[PDB]
Protein backbone atom coordinates (compact mmCIF):
# COMPACT_ATOMS: atom_id res chain seq x y z
CA UNK A 1 0.00 0.00 0.00
CA UNK A 2 1.42 3.37 -1.10
CA UNK A 3 0.51 6.52 0.81
CA UNK A 4 -1.67 4.90 3.46
CA UNK A 5 -1.21 4.38 7.19
CA UNK A 6 -0.81 1.48 9.59
CA UNK A 7 -4.14 -0.25 10.18
CA UNK A 8 -4.35 -0.25 14.03
CA UNK A 9 -4.10 -3.87 15.21
CA UNK A 10 -7.57 -5.48 15.14
CA UNK A 11 -9.16 -2.78 12.95
CA UNK A 12 -8.90 -4.83 9.70
CA UNK A 13 -9.85 -8.19 11.27
CA UNK A 14 -10.98 -9.80 8.00
CA UNK A 15 -7.55 -9.33 6.36
CA UNK A 16 -5.81 -12.59 5.35
CA UNK A 17 -2.10 -13.11 4.57
CA UNK A 18 -1.38 -15.93 2.10
CA UNK A 19 2.05 -17.61 2.31
CA UNK A 20 3.73 -20.18 0.03
CA UNK A 21 6.64 -22.02 1.67
CA UNK A 22 6.54 -19.30 4.35
CA UNK A 23 6.97 -16.40 1.89
CA UNK A 24 4.40 -13.66 1.41
CA UNK A 25 2.26 -14.38 -1.67
CA UNK A 26 -0.84 -12.17 -1.55
CA UNK A 27 -3.66 -10.96 0.66
CA UNK A 28 -7.23 -12.22 0.97
CA UNK A 29 -10.50 -11.53 2.80
CA UNK A 30 -12.22 -13.80 5.30
CA UNK A 31 -15.99 -14.00 4.53
CA UNK A 32 -16.89 -16.75 6.99
CA UNK A 33 -15.03 -19.19 9.21
CA UNK A 34 -13.82 -21.47 6.39
CA UNK A 35 -13.91 -19.25 3.30
CA UNK A 36 -11.47 -16.66 1.99
CA UNK A 37 -11.77 -14.56 -1.17
CA UNK A 38 -8.54 -13.65 -2.98
CA UNK A 39 -7.35 -12.95 -6.59
CA UNK A 40 -6.95 -15.73 -9.15
CA UNK A 41 -3.64 -14.35 -10.44
CA UNK A 42 -2.04 -15.02 -7.07
CA UNK A 43 -1.97 -18.70 -8.01
CA UNK A 44 -0.54 -18.49 -11.53
CA UNK A 45 2.88 -19.87 -10.46
CA UNK A 46 2.05 -22.32 -7.70
CA UNK A 47 3.65 -25.73 -8.18
CA UNK A 48 2.95 -27.42 -4.85
CA UNK A 49 -0.55 -26.57 -3.62
CA UNK A 50 0.24 -28.20 -0.29
CA UNK A 51 2.57 -25.33 0.62
CA UNK A 52 -0.19 -22.68 0.70
CA UNK A 53 -1.11 -21.30 4.12
CA UNK A 54 -3.63 -18.61 5.11
CA UNK A 55 -3.02 -16.52 8.23
CA UNK A 56 -5.76 -14.65 10.06
CA UNK A 57 -5.28 -12.18 12.93
CA UNK A 58 -1.91 -11.11 11.56
CA UNK A 59 -0.64 -7.55 12.09
CA UNK A 60 3.16 -7.19 12.54
CA UNK A 61 5.09 -9.79 10.54
CA UNK A 62 8.15 -9.39 12.76
CA UNK A 63 6.58 -10.86 15.86
CA UNK A 64 4.21 -13.49 17.10
CA UNK A 65 1.69 -12.13 19.57
CA UNK A 66 -0.68 -15.10 19.84
CA UNK A 67 -3.68 -13.64 17.95
CA UNK A 68 -2.50 -15.17 14.61
CA UNK A 69 -4.26 -18.29 13.34
CA UNK A 70 -2.76 -20.26 10.44
CA UNK A 71 -4.61 -22.79 8.33
CA UNK A 72 -3.84 -24.99 5.36
CA UNK A 73 -5.75 -24.25 2.16
CA UNK A 74 -7.93 -27.25 1.13
CA UNK A 75 -9.36 -25.86 -2.11
CA UNK A 76 -8.54 -22.93 -4.44
CA UNK A 77 -11.52 -22.34 -6.74
CA UNK A 78 -11.08 -20.18 -9.86
CA UNK A 79 -13.71 -19.23 -12.50
CA UNK A 80 -13.48 -21.07 -15.82
CA UNK A 81 -13.30 -17.66 -17.51
CA UNK A 82 -10.04 -16.62 -15.85
CA UNK A 83 -6.99 -16.99 -18.12
CA UNK A 84 -3.60 -17.13 -16.36
CA UNK A 85 -1.41 -14.11 -16.95
CA UNK A 86 -4.37 -11.85 -17.68
CA UNK A 87 -6.57 -9.50 -15.68
CA UNK A 88 -10.22 -10.35 -16.30
CA UNK A 89 -12.19 -12.50 -13.80
CA UNK A 90 -9.47 -12.08 -11.18
CA UNK A 91 -11.06 -13.86 -8.24
CA UNK A 92 -10.43 -17.03 -6.24
CA UNK A 93 -12.48 -18.65 -3.46
CA UNK A 94 -10.35 -20.57 -0.95
CA UNK A 95 -11.65 -23.22 1.43
CA UNK A 96 -9.60 -23.55 4.64
CA UNK A 97 -8.80 -27.09 5.92
CA UNK A 98 -10.19 -26.19 9.37
CA UNK A 99 -12.29 -23.13 10.36
CA UNK A 100 -10.64 -20.18 12.00
CA UNK A 101 -11.99 -19.26 15.46
CA UNK A 102 -13.65 -15.84 15.49
CA UNK A 103 -12.09 -13.48 18.07
CA UNK A 104 -11.65 -9.73 18.56
CA UNK A 105 -8.83 -10.06 16.00
CA UNK A 106 -10.42 -12.43 13.45
CA UNK A 107 -13.84 -11.50 12.01
CA UNK A 108 -15.31 -12.05 8.55
CA UNK A 109 -16.22 -9.20 6.20
CA UNK A 110 -19.81 -9.47 4.99
CA UNK A 111 -20.29 -10.76 1.43
CA UNK A 112 -23.27 -8.62 0.36
CA UNK A 113 -26.24 -9.58 -1.75
CA UNK A 114 -25.76 -8.57 -5.39
CA UNK A 115 -28.71 -6.17 -5.54
CA UNK A 116 -27.58 -4.37 -2.44
CA UNK A 117 -24.01 -4.18 -3.75
CA UNK A 118 -25.05 -2.85 -7.19
CA UNK A 119 -27.80 -0.48 -6.01
CA UNK A 120 -26.24 0.86 -2.84
CA UNK A 121 -22.65 -0.07 -2.14
CA UNK A 122 -21.46 0.82 -5.66
CA UNK A 123 -22.38 4.46 -4.86
CA UNK A 124 -20.50 4.78 -1.59
CA UNK A 125 -17.58 6.92 -2.70
CA UNK A 126 -14.74 5.83 -0.43
CA UNK A 127 -13.67 2.35 0.61
CA UNK A 128 -10.65 0.86 2.38
CA UNK A 129 -7.94 -1.26 0.75
CA UNK A 130 -5.30 -2.98 2.88
CA UNK A 131 -2.28 -5.24 2.80
CA UNK A 132 1.40 -5.89 3.54
CA UNK A 133 2.45 -5.05 -0.04
CA UNK A 134 5.11 -2.62 -1.25
CA UNK A 135 5.10 0.81 0.44
CA UNK A 136 6.41 2.38 -2.79
CA UNK A 137 6.75 1.32 -6.40
CA UNK A 138 10.02 -0.73 -6.59
CA UNK A 139 10.19 -0.56 -2.79
CA UNK A 140 10.20 -2.91 0.18
CA UNK A 141 6.99 -4.49 1.53
CA UNK A 142 5.42 -3.49 4.84
CA UNK A 143 6.02 -5.22 8.18
CA UNK A 144 2.75 -3.88 9.73
CA UNK A 145 -0.60 -4.08 7.96
CA UNK A 146 -1.36 -0.91 5.99
CA UNK A 147 -4.69 0.60 4.97
CA UNK A 148 -5.75 3.28 2.50
CA UNK A 149 -9.04 5.08 1.78
CA UNK A 150 -9.68 5.22 -1.99
CA UNK A 151 -12.58 6.75 -3.99
CA UNK A 152 -14.32 4.68 -6.63
CA UNK A 153 -14.78 5.86 -10.20
CA UNK A 154 -17.50 4.98 -12.68
CA UNK A 155 -15.70 3.16 -15.51
CA UNK A 156 -16.46 5.80 -18.16
CA UNK A 157 -14.81 8.35 -15.84
CA UNK A 158 -11.78 6.12 -15.20
CA UNK A 159 -11.19 5.78 -18.93
CA UNK A 160 -11.62 9.52 -19.48
CA UNK A 161 -9.38 10.52 -16.55
CA UNK A 162 -6.67 7.96 -17.39
CA UNK A 163 -3.56 8.59 -19.49
CA UNK A 164 -6.88 0.76 -20.23
CA UNK A 165 -9.13 -2.29 -20.68
CA UNK A 166 -11.61 -2.10 -17.82
CA UNK A 167 -14.32 -4.75 -18.20
CA UNK A 168 -17.68 -5.09 -16.47
CA UNK A 169 -15.91 -7.46 -14.03
CA UNK A 170 -13.65 -4.66 -12.76
CA UNK A 171 -13.77 -1.15 -11.34
CA UNK A 172 -11.21 1.63 -10.81
CA UNK A 173 -10.50 3.32 -7.52
CA UNK A 174 -7.79 5.55 -6.19
CA UNK A 175 -5.83 8.55 -7.45
CA UNK A 176 -4.07 9.56 -10.66
CA UNK A 177 -1.37 11.73 -9.01
CA UNK A 178 0.96 8.85 -8.09
CA UNK A 179 0.63 9.36 -4.33
CA UNK A 180 -1.76 6.63 -3.13
CA UNK A 181 -2.53 3.12 -4.45
CA UNK A 182 -2.49 -0.55 -3.56
CA UNK A 183 0.69 -2.26 -4.89
CA UNK A 184 2.51 -5.55 -5.50
CA UNK A 185 2.07 -7.76 -2.48
CA UNK A 186 -1.45 -6.40 -1.78
CA UNK A 187 -3.13 -8.39 -4.58
CA UNK A 188 -6.03 -10.48 -3.36
CA UNK A 189 -6.75 -8.19 -0.41
CA UNK A 190 -10.01 -6.51 0.42
CA UNK A 191 -11.64 -3.36 -0.96
CA UNK A 192 -14.15 -2.94 1.95
CA UNK A 193 -17.15 -0.58 1.90
CA UNK A 194 -18.97 0.81 4.91
CA UNK A 195 -22.75 1.24 4.91
CA UNK A 196 -24.87 2.06 7.95
CA UNK A 197 -22.49 0.68 10.56
CA UNK A 198 -21.34 -2.50 8.77
CA UNK A 199 -18.53 -3.28 6.30
CA UNK A 200 -18.94 -5.28 3.10
CA UNK A 201 -16.71 -6.82 0.43
CA UNK A 202 -16.93 -4.84 -2.81
CA UNK A 203 -13.59 -5.40 -4.52
CA UNK A 204 -10.39 -7.45 -4.63
CA UNK A 205 -6.98 -5.79 -5.20
CA UNK A 206 -6.17 -6.95 -8.75
CA UNK A 207 -3.98 -4.84 -11.06
CA UNK A 208 -2.57 -1.42 -11.96
CA UNK A 209 -0.03 0.28 -14.22
CA UNK A 210 2.79 -0.20 -11.78
CA UNK A 211 1.95 1.34 -8.39
CA UNK A 212 0.75 4.86 -7.88
CA UNK A 213 1.75 5.52 -11.52
CA UNK A 214 0.80 9.10 -12.41
CA UNK A 215 -2.21 9.14 -14.76
CA UNK A 216 -3.52 5.72 -13.66
CA UNK A 217 -5.83 4.30 -11.01
CA UNK A 218 -5.92 0.99 -9.16
CA UNK A 219 -8.06 -1.74 -10.72
CA UNK A 220 -10.21 -3.99 -8.53
CA UNK A 221 -12.28 -7.10 -9.24
CA UNK A 222 -16.00 -6.18 -9.12
CA UNK A 223 -17.14 -8.67 -6.51
CA UNK A 224 -20.84 -7.98 -7.13
CA UNK A 225 -20.58 -9.92 -10.41
CA UNK A 226 -19.58 -13.06 -8.51
CA UNK A 227 -21.96 -13.20 -5.52
CA UNK A 228 -24.12 -16.04 -6.86
CA UNK A 229 -21.05 -17.91 -8.15
CA UNK A 230 -19.47 -17.67 -4.66
CA UNK A 231 -22.63 -18.59 -2.77
CA UNK A 232 -23.22 -21.68 -4.88
CA UNK A 233 -19.65 -22.88 -4.36
CA UNK A 234 -19.88 -22.32 -0.59
CA UNK A 235 -22.86 -24.73 -0.55
CA UNK A 236 -20.90 -27.41 -2.45
CA UNK A 237 -18.88 -30.34 -1.16
CA UNK A 238 -15.08 -30.24 -1.46
CA UNK A 239 -13.37 -32.22 -4.25
CA UNK A 240 -10.01 -34.02 -4.19
CA UNK A 241 -7.19 -31.92 -5.69
CA UNK A 242 -6.63 -28.39 -4.34
CA UNK A 243 -7.20 -26.47 -7.55
CA UNK A 244 -10.75 -26.48 -8.87
CA UNK A 245 -11.85 -24.59 -11.97
CA UNK A 246 -15.60 -23.93 -11.70
CA UNK A 247 -17.90 -22.75 -14.48
CA UNK A 248 -18.68 -19.06 -14.61
CA UNK A 249 -21.37 -17.87 -14.62
CA UNK B 250 -41.00 1.96 -0.79
CA UNK B 251 -38.50 0.68 -3.37
CA UNK B 252 -35.11 -0.93 -2.94
CA UNK B 253 -33.45 1.07 -5.70
CA UNK B 254 -34.02 4.32 -3.82
CA UNK B 255 -32.16 4.85 -0.54
CA UNK B 256 -31.93 1.07 -0.16
CA UNK B 257 -35.70 0.98 0.44
CA UNK B 258 -34.96 2.38 3.91
CA UNK B 259 -33.33 -1.00 4.86
CA UNK B 260 -30.17 -1.10 6.95
CA UNK B 261 -28.98 -4.18 4.96
CA UNK B 262 -30.73 -6.17 2.22
CA UNK B 263 -33.97 -5.26 0.44
CA UNK B 264 -36.49 -7.22 -1.73
CA UNK B 265 -39.34 -5.62 -3.72
CA UNK B 266 -42.66 -7.50 -3.85
CA UNK B 267 -45.76 -7.35 -6.04
CA UNK B 268 -47.35 -4.00 -5.21
CA UNK B 269 -46.19 -1.17 -2.98
CA UNK B 270 -44.50 -3.86 -0.84
CA UNK B 271 -40.90 -4.16 0.37
CA UNK B 272 -39.17 -6.58 2.77
CA UNK B 273 -35.81 -5.85 4.40
CA UNK B 274 -33.56 -8.69 5.43
CA UNK B 275 -30.34 -9.11 7.44
CA UNK B 276 -27.20 -11.15 6.93
CA UNK B 277 -26.65 -14.31 8.96
CA UNK B 278 -25.63 -13.36 12.51
CA UNK B 279 -28.21 -10.53 12.61
CA UNK B 280 -31.96 -10.29 13.15
CA UNK B 281 -34.44 -7.72 11.80
CA UNK B 282 -36.04 -5.41 14.39
CA UNK B 283 -39.76 -4.61 14.61
CA UNK B 284 -39.20 -1.39 12.68
CA UNK B 285 -38.81 -3.71 9.65
CA UNK B 286 -35.53 -2.04 8.63
CA UNK B 287 -32.84 -2.28 11.33
CA UNK B 288 -30.52 -5.26 11.88
CA UNK B 289 -29.08 -6.18 15.28
CA UNK B 290 -26.32 -8.76 15.88
CA UNK B 291 -27.40 -12.13 17.30
CA UNK B 292 -23.84 -13.51 17.71
CA UNK B 293 -20.64 -12.32 19.35
CA UNK B 294 -18.69 -11.71 16.10
CA UNK B 295 -21.12 -10.73 13.36
CA UNK B 296 -19.63 -10.05 9.95
CA UNK B 297 -18.51 -6.55 9.06
CA UNK B 298 -18.18 -5.18 12.60
CA UNK B 299 -14.89 -4.37 14.33
CA UNK B 300 -14.91 -5.67 17.92
CA UNK B 301 -12.31 -3.27 19.35
CA UNK B 302 -14.31 -0.31 18.01
CA UNK B 303 -17.74 -1.68 18.95
CA UNK B 304 -16.49 -2.05 22.52
CA UNK B 305 -14.74 1.33 22.42
CA UNK B 306 -18.18 2.80 21.72
CA UNK B 307 -20.14 0.47 24.01
Ligand SMILES: Nc1ccc(NC(=O)c2cnn(-c3ccccc3)c2O)cn1
Nearest residue numbers: 041042182183184187206207208210218
Ligand atom coordinates in the same frame (compact mmCIF):
# COMPACT_ATOMS: atom_id res chain seq x y z
N1 LIG C 1 -2.63 -1.51 -7.94
C1 LIG C 1 -1.93 -2.77 -8.06
C2 LIG C 1 -2.21 -3.81 -7.19
C3 LIG C 1 -1.56 -5.00 -7.31
C4 LIG C 1 -0.54 -5.16 -8.27
N2 LIG C 1 0.08 -6.43 -8.45
C5 LIG C 1 1.31 -6.61 -9.03
O1 LIG C 1 1.90 -5.63 -9.51
C6 LIG C 1 1.87 -7.97 -9.17
C7 LIG C 1 3.00 -8.34 -9.93
N3 LIG C 1 3.16 -9.64 -9.79
N4 LIG C 1 2.13 -10.18 -8.96
C8 LIG C 1 1.95 -11.49 -8.63
C9 LIG C 1 2.11 -12.49 -9.60
C10 LIG C 1 1.92 -13.83 -9.26
C11 LIG C 1 1.57 -14.17 -7.96
C12 LIG C 1 1.39 -13.17 -6.99
C13 LIG C 1 1.56 -11.85 -7.33
C14 LIG C 1 1.37 -9.15 -8.56
O2 LIG C 1 0.30 -9.27 -7.76
C15 LIG C 1 -0.31 -4.08 -9.14
N5 LIG C 1 -0.96 -2.94 -9.00
Ligand SMILES: [Ca+2]
Nearest residue numbers: 059060063064
Ligand atom coordinates in the same frame (compact mmCIF):
# COMPACT_ATOMS: atom_id res chain seq x y z
CA1 LIG D 1 2.44 -11.11 14.17
Ligand SMILES: [Cl-]
Nearest residue numbers: 071072097098
Ligand atom coordinates in the same frame (compact mmCIF):
# COMPACT_ATOMS: atom_id res chain seq x y z
CL1 LIG E 1 -5.42 -26.41 9.06
Ligand SMILES: [Cl-]
Nearest residue numbers: 235236237238
Ligand atom coordinates in the same frame (compact mmCIF):
# COMPACT_ATOMS: atom_id res chain seq x y z
CL1 LIG F 1 -22.24 -30.52 -4.75
Ligand SMILES: [Cl-]
Nearest residue numbers: 049241242243
Ligand atom coordinates in the same frame (compact mmCIF):
# COMPACT_ATOMS: atom_id res chain seq x y z
CL1 LIG G 1 -3.64 -31.21 -5.29
